[model samples]
Target: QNITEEFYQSTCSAVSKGYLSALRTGWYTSVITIELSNIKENKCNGTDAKVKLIKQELDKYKNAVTELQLLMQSTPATGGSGGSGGSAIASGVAVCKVLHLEGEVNKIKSALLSTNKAVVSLSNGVSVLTFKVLDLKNYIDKQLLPILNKQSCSISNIETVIEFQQKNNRLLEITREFSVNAGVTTPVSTYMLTNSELLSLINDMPITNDQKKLMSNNVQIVRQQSYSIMCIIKEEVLAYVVQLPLYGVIDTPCWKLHTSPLCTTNTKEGSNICLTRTDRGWYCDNAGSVSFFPQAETCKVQSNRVFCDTMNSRTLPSEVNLCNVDIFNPKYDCKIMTSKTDVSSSVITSLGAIVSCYGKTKCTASNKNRGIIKTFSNGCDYVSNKGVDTVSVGNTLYYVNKQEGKSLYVKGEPIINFYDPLVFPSDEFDASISQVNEKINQSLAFIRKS
Candidate 1:
């Protein structure tokens, strides 16, 4: 009975709530710091592996805090005279639950502390190495690669420099995991201890003065190589720039080229210099200007005009400002031809023009459909560039205008000789074949009777 009242008072107090609130805030601050550093520089994937563990523990901590806060809020105040008897019994059970939760929170706090310590240790260990590698990368990008633009050099030489640059980049990436399994935190030892020979060399005890000196020098060499990859790249770039422009020194192109600052001097070669960007690649006006060819195919020089294998050989067609195929235009509407056409008689039309009426005089008069020399051009003699076929039946030629939807007999031949089958054959040909079959059957029957 006494314990129930003490439990209600203990948890509901401002001090108890304050302590839990402060712990929750502190947990958040530390967890966020750990998560943010996870992607930065993970040494040996130790930090990588710990990220999941930290999140799980933080979730447990959060749940426990939430449960405690709810318990505190839902818990009734001490000393209610009328309902005190029943309320005390309920508060008694809650006290036990609260105690269990308190134990869980303590465990959570311990785990959080351990995770925070590991994160801090890993971050500090790799921070120096990461910065040094970044410095090397910056120098190569800012100081080296930019200046060699358009300068003449051998392809192999350029590849060699590029290879070194690539190597430096990869090393930077892999070094993030170098300290993962290392026993020591120092950069040199972290790298050396990973190797068997270097580890054995450093671990050997009671070594001679020379042996000790040898070990020391080896450590220095490893450290220097780790940092000096950038320097080696710089040296290679320098060598290529100097040895290049090996062409006729006296007749060398007017453009001055070097690695430092990367500038082009003298204004003699202006628009005459055909340094135009083509569909394929850059084409230089002066063949002599380009000492090195990067592509596998041959480079051709025709007097002043230089042709690179990289440049497109075929001539591009002249561009036309034509209207889009299916778009609606206000001026044209849906009509094929915008020009007005009114004539006294029939005019021969090309395949492109589709006329609604055949005779001009018939179409011009008022109510012409009533009465006139109404001779519609019934001769379907139209032809098209598309799908025109001629099928000969009994030595008479016919023209098939598949595109114009017309079947025509040859010139001076009547429309009676026309057969629609060789043109755009559809349901019409099937119906014609059925009629022919019926006629033949009737003729056969008549012959049999005779």
Candidate 2:
């Protein structure tokens, strides 16, 4: 008797049917998103009208429950790799999830019963339909709600875990991809992780202590060996020595029958920078004595300069300066008797002493250029502090060799041996990254349990 038409109009005043139907027909994947906009107030309507509203609400709930039950009973889709191993439990965390959802859906059943009581009372001839707006709204809310993200137990957090695991897996995979093989070439050129990348990965890990342990434990050996992932990158500083160019190195040995004045100049008799003959071979200590290979050559003194000549080829002296390279400045195995020979020279011109290089010298000095040596006389040098004599460009330092008024050039810093103080095995590289995966798995397991 106290009821009125206004009382029957519920708080949903006007809710979107798009959400309503989504709740009704769409199954689990889509349905998880059907958050009804309740707590919105009433629109006045008749008992018949309210009954219709109630019916639609029931349909939404009914459709959801029915779909979920069917889903729970059915096996989830998988690629037809239908090898059922060990009576297949449900997909990852699905069973736990569905049960939680089913519990929520069942609560709506209680509201269904409450709605019917209101429906029956209104249908009674003795009491005419009227407003139960507040009453109906209360029922709609009290039964259950999507709860506006307050559901700590909700799948919203689950998806976040899913995303975390996604990154964790990728981190693990790249760590696995990291490798080293002594059997392969040394000075490897491959995918690399900077110290920053390595450190960054550890920082983002889900667990705290494991993050510290993950980096520290695996890298213990590395630090002791004085290594980093970057150790593999070797820095070689080349010495721009007044090296005999390749042309001068293995001279085309074409000799004539003693092509000089009296054939006696280089002999023990007439004398010159003794192009001495030995059990080892014929040799000369002449500075232009670039001919070091294919040893059976003859040396002759024309003036004070000497020559390395073969029966077929004769190499004369010329002057030039060149940098460190593959054919590399040759080393004189011949004993230095001091050239009866004055300095014979290399053909590499002063102009051939170009500042530029193909990609990537040195004489010893400043202890900076390991491969190139520094000399006050004539050789390669590492120059620093002496600004006028040295030139630097593109991070490469070049030093000039001035011996006996001859200007020679050697280029780039000779840091090859300096950078890699100690080399470690590359095989162990994955250990640091591998340890993090164990840390990641621990986090994943906790999420699965939750």
Candidate 3:
């Protein structure tokens, strides 16, 4: 074994002082390795293994140094005036331990040089550092140190650091920057803001109005936000059709519920029907009244009435009061019973006074022929003579013509004081002045409202 008296000096310089290469040799020297050894030697100063485990244990203490330093600055000393006695005894014990450490360290170095010297050599083979007995002793002595006798850090500090390590466990020391939003004042966490909202993360502080003005003048203020419609509003465009004349049959959608004018192509019923368009939309008309109304008359719905202008009719043009009645009933003197010449209706037929059936009748055809002799023999009613007389049977008027021995029977239209809604719904000859005045007042009120 090579003996060296410079050991104590080297150990103190390298391990305790910040010098390298005094006791430490490069068996596995790297940044982290050195860091481990430094931590280990420092810890051995308080109390003293595979650096794999050393690195792992190192994770437990990475922030310990800074934390311990902070703790030292913040902690008040306990009885510094009397601490000379405690430290004097503590310094002596450290020297005493290191001087004896060499012997035990040598034993480990001695075992490493056994039949397993090959194993020891192979362990550091990648780094090519050979182990030595003297350096081992030096390492041992240096780690358990009173290196230069200055103990600014109390031994209790290691205990305090260990307590800190035990109490708190965390992987990262997360910290965030201070920030204030555009209008909000108090600083909040930078993590809460987006890059766009931040405006500038690093620019120097400017007046609040400066940022406000810049935001106000942003280009997006003019650009409207876009949105998509879910097809309720159809995609619209300006479209046109060619100019045409008064009438048109444009292709458009027709609703069956309220039949559209275009529904003429799809409708099934009606012959005298007409449709017209005005400010009001398409409306249909079947009120031309009947099959033979003016016989295909000039049909057009205007002013809520139909004008039968007689397209080639045998009658003069006349305005129909209402357009829904049959000409067989022939209200309003409608000439549906027109002849082929200039359209004339039979008065008897037009009057709705048709014959229903004949009835018996009597007459006074006496000797009045012989200078007004009172005889029950009438001239016309004497068993079918020439003259005739009409008789009434329950609102029925029978023309008992004695000419052909047959009576012309007629239908009854009762002239009575009963309401006939079909003919004239209101009383036409109301002669009472008070009632007439009341009616006039109501009419005046209605006209005023209009």
TM-score of each: 0.13, 0.15, 0.12
- Give each model's whole-structure lDDT: 0.23, 0.24, 0.21
**What does the lDDT read for residue 288 in candidate 2?**
47
Q: Show model 2 residue runs off by greater than 4 Å.
A: 1-163, 166-171, 178-384, 389-450
| Runs of candidate 3 exceeding 4 Å displacement | 1-154, 157-171, 175-450
Report the lDDT tens digits of candidate 1 across residue range 129-212.
011111233343443333322232111234434444553433333333321311111233332223443333333323356434
Residue 8 lDDT, candidate 3, scale 0-100: 11
**Per-candidate clash tally:** 2, 41, 7
**How displaced is residue 13 in candidate 2, in Å?**
96
Clash total of candidate 1: 2
Error of 3 at 316 (Å): 71
The residue pairs that clash in candidate 1, if any, are: 44-177, 44-180
lDDT of 2 by residue, 1-450 (tens): 010010001110110000000000000100011112223323323234333444344444444333333433332332235442211222212322332343433332233334421211111122111111112233334432332123231212334334334423322222222222211111111122224433443343333564345334433221121111100100110000000000122212221110000011222322321111112222222234322213433333221222332222223232101111211223312111111322212111111111211111222223244333333222112122221344433345554333112222323332221111112111221232223334446666765798
Instruction: Output the TM-score of candidate 1.
Output: 0.13
* Regions more than 4 Å wrong, model 1: 1-157, 165-170, 179-450
